From a paper:
Alpha-B.1.1.7, Beta-B.1.351, Gamma-P.1, and Delta-B.1.617.2 variants of SARS-CoV-2 express multiple mutations in the spike protein (S). The RBD mutations found in Alpha (N501Y), Beta (K417N, E484K, and N501Y), Gamma (K417T, E484K, and N501Y), and Delta (L452R and T478K) are located in or closely adjacent to the ACE2-interacting surface where they have the potential to modulate ACE2 interaction or disrupt the binding of neutralizing mAbs. To understand this, we generated 674 mAbs from Beta-infected individuals and performed a detailed structure-function analysis of the 27 most potent mAbs: one binding the spike N-terminal domain (NTD), the rest the receptor-binding domain (RBD). A detailed structure-function analysis comprising 22 X-ray and cryo-EM structures is presented for 16 Fabs most in complexes with RBD or S, which allows an understanding of the changes in antigenicity of the Beta S protein.
Beta-49 and -50 potently neutralized all strains of SARS-CoV-2 tested, bound tightly to the full S trimer but only very weakly to the RBD and did not block binding of ACE2. Both belong to the IgVH1-69 gene family, and we determined crystal structures of Fab/RBD complexes and cryo-EM Fab/S complexes for both (STAR Methods). The relatively high resolution (2.8 Å) of the Beta-49 Fab/S structure suggested that the complex is rather rigid. Both mAbs attach in the same configuration, despite the presence of 19 amino acid differences in the variable domain of the heavy chain (VH) alone. We determined structures for Beta-6 and Beta-54 of the widely used IgVH4-39 gene family. Beta-54 has a significantly different angle of attack on the RBD compared with Beta-6, with the Fab pivoting by 32° around residue 501 on the RBD. This change in binding pose appears to derive from the difference in length of the H3 (15 residues in Beta-6, 18 in Beta-54). Altering the pose allows the different length H3 loops to make similar contacts, while the H1 and H2 contact regions pivot round. Overall, the HC interaction area is similar for both mAbs (461 and 54 Å2 for the HC and LC, respectively, of Beta-54). Beta-6 and -54 are examples of the two classes of IgVH4-39 Beta mAbs, with the shorter loop Beta-6-like mAbs forming the major class.
Author numbering:
A (entry chain L): 1 to 214
B (entry chain B): 1 to 216
C (entry chain E): 332 to 527
D (entry chain A): 3 to 133, 139 to 219
E (entry chain H): 1 to 229
Write the structure that this text describes.
Amino acid sequence: DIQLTQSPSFLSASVGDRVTITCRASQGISSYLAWYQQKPGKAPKLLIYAASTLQSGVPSRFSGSGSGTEFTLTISSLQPEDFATYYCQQLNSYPLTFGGGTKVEIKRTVAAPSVFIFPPSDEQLKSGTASVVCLLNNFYPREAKVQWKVDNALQSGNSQESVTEQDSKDSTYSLSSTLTLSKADYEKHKVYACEVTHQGLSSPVTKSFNRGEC
Amino acid sequence: DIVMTQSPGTLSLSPGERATLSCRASQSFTSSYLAWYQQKPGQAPRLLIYGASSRATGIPDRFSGTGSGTDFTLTISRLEPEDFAVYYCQQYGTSPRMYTFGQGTKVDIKRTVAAPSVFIFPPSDEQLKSGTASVVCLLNNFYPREAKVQWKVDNALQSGNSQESVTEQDSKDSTYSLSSTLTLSKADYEKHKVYACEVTHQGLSSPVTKSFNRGE
Amino acid sequence: HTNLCPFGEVFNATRFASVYAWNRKRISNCVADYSVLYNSASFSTFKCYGVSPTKLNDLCFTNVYADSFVIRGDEVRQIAPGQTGNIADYNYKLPDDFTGCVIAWNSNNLDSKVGGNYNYLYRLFRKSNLKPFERDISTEIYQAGSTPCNGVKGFNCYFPLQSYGFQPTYGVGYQPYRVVVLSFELLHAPATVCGK
Amino acid sequence: QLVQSGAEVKKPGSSVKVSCKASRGTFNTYVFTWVRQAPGQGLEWMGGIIPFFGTADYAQKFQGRVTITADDSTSTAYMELSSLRSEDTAVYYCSRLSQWDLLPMWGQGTLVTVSSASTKGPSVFPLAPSSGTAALGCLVKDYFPEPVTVSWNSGALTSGVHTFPAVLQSSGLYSLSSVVTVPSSSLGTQTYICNVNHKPSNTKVDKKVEPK
Amino acid sequence: QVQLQESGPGLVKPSETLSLTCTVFGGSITSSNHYWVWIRQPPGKGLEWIGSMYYSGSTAYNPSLTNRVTISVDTSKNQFSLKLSSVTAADTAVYYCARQIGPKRPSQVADWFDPWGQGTLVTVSSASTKGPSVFPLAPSSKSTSGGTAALGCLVKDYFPEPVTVSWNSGALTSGVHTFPAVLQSSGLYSLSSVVTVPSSSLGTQTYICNVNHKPSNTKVDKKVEPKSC
Ligand SMILES: *[C@@H]1O[C@H](CO[C@@H]2O[C@@H](C)[C@@H](O)[C@@H](O)[C@@H]2O)[C@@H](O[C@@H]2O[C@H](CO)[C@@H](O[C@@H]3O[C@H](CO[C@H]4O[C@H](CO)[C@@H](O)[C@H](O)[C@@H]4O)[C@@H](O)[C@H](O)[C@@H]3O)[C@H](O)[C@H]2NC(C)=O)[C@H](O)[C@H]1NC(C)=O
């Protein structure tokens, strides 16, 4: 069984930088290698085959080279839409095997998040459960901190977060934090707020609403 | 002649498992061949494998065949619901004298052991007018297929005056049902009083008897 | 006699042998038809040498030999008298005075695996050419240099046999072909395989 | 792709001759054999013949009773079975080989029924339920030929119904039983009627089953 | 342009049998120079080749999947299928069908995959299927005078994955963010799909989120309006 080792596992480069990904085979497979690009939620897309032959329909900034055991994929000018996980694949011996993949993140200028807060709809309060959603929209870098305050009481253990993959056009991220409560516990308190801190912010941002008040 | 013996008698497998059927010959195949057939109820035999390891035309690739000399194998990698039928193996040869068949192997959808619900039916008063009595014993929904029915008339075990009939494996609960009919003349029927059928089955910890009293 | 010659047990062989280890079947004491061979249209190659197929049904022979193996398309040409190549020289050679027929058909649907069928082999190296109807199945390490190969493969030390690719996507010249070589001998003895 | 003659109905002690026409003149290179199969039973080889020589062989169980012939001019093989008994009721197959391949060609089969040949309707008798679930049914007895069709409540009642394959009695007639299991509470407030139809005799019997 | 459209159930109970089907478009499946393959990708993991098949019957399976893999082809329907029995939680993955190019000559560079199916997530779980409830995430009444506001839909309490969310039957994609689902403590998934629109359009433009959950045959079109007081 031929094993493919892909280095590095992750990398973060700026727009316009020159990126190089290495794929090392456990044995010498001559030029029997192909490269793939997998964007989030999509199937892998063929980029290079025969180690260096570019597939019809791939930007010329992509290129592959190498022979024997070590091969390299090179993006001469990284673009925002190039955020993906890249896989190599040996095409010499069965069973067919892939590399571990190299996730390529985009490094751009810092962007502060736009913060929104959504009360639980009257339709959901009828079900006995209350969900309060806080949105952090189009920010970079990925690291952000969301604190839930219910009547200035910091909450913990009743919130889950979810972050979108890097946007293919502005290279930003988006985060949603959902505060789950019971309808009884939701009606006991009044002021609901999510406090956001993110590198692009300069004093913490708090979006708040009052339960029942328009 | 060349005696062909198959095994197992009944192959109780769940859909999705791998089936393995054996075919044995009394003598090594000096100048002889081997085929495998599949037969569904009310249908003709259908050729699956020939030449020990040749898939016939249209047969799915999950059907495989191996063996040499005296021992041969019919392998089904993944059992499909359309594959639960009887399978035969026949050896043939260049000359006419060779041809002999195996006794067959039933591949049924496996299930847990289920004991039959036993019912007995006295002959109707309408049939008694005709001079013949027919007592019926129903073995309802059981598994495995093997079952035993014995008729006792005033504690006298009957023999040679009954006939059985077994349904196909049910498509919903994967069980079988048996019907045995005791046939006596009207004169011989009124000479006795207690009529019962004793059912012996794997699901029963002991033989179950269902009886009726001629009249009450 | 009365029994028919088991040509069904050689043409319809579920598995054929590799050309380097070609299987030979001896046919004797049987009525050999010859209508359905030349009448079946499954065969891609059907060339007879030394005798005509039409004049074959009404002719007697002491013995008939059925040799069967598998090669690729562009090597079918070499199954004929006076040919040269890897198959003719190192695997299966017909004599210059060959009297028989060569029958071949494409078996890509049977002898190809999507991972490549690597069960059919052919002899790639041999110190001398095979002389007619010789079968060489030795796997002696081929010493191609001075250095004595101590039975271990390596530099100038080969395995003499090479494997056919045989993938269903292969070109026609590299797809597998099953071959049957019927040779007829007329020794000084009453005959056993005639026909029609 | 052999083609056999149509179904036959014979009395005991009589003879039957089944034909098997070979697709064109493929005859001589072949050996033709005859295999029979009783209803619900296995396969049994009867004999074979080599057409080009007229040499025929038989199974000892049938030696004497069966004669297998062949006509090269019409590409047809024949099997004659004499002194027929009720146990000879079966589907009879002709099958062949080939000189230059190993492949079994089979005919479509010929049904031969050996019994007193009449066309009569069945007598339907009720299988009354015994006095949480109970069983009841109908006894479709003494009819010929196959088959009969049975429905319950004219197709309304299908759950728990078992219609058994018919058995051939020694009288030459068929007997069939069809039963159904129902909850014991519905015995006094649900009429159960089995619908027996026998097309060969144009028989339509609707019999109501009663708890005595 | 050859296309592959796969289909099949996204939920299989343990020890049962996974079954998927791939339909070829813009080309025949009886290709004399291509294989028809299956490839799976566990969530958060790499790619694993399952098997390859030629239209005439031959197969090659990954030895890491033992003898519980069978690929089949239906030439009369331009389809090829995959079957995986005795599935465990280790079989939960997004399964792709793809076309592999075969070599025409010995030692020819081939065996790459192009094109691919869209991918079908199959979850191995005995848990029952539940369709989601769709609640609106209304834009705030405050908002701005002529800036940008945010609205969305809350897709809560469904199993298994996935659900698909579009806006205005696909006519709204700019500014949309459909977040990856989170597995709540109740064992059911939940996600939210949001979109940023100008505040001036909140009274003159409708916004409907189209939620689809194939495992439960659920289709919900939910309108998201500014909340009235
Ligand atoms: C071993 O031999 C068998 C049988 O060979 C047949 O008989 C010999 C004498 C020659 O004439 C051969 O050409 C014959 O094929 C071979 O099996 C055959 O394989 C082919 C595929 O290569 C099958 O072709 C199919 O045919 C289907 C329809 O056939 C119609 O015509 C046949 C006449 O032969 C008839 O029997 C049948 O009822 C139909 O009316 C077709 O639907 C399908 O798509 C495909 O084209 C062929 O059917 C097979 N034979 C039979 C009788 O079915 C083996 O290939 C051979 N093996 C080797 C290694 O040589």
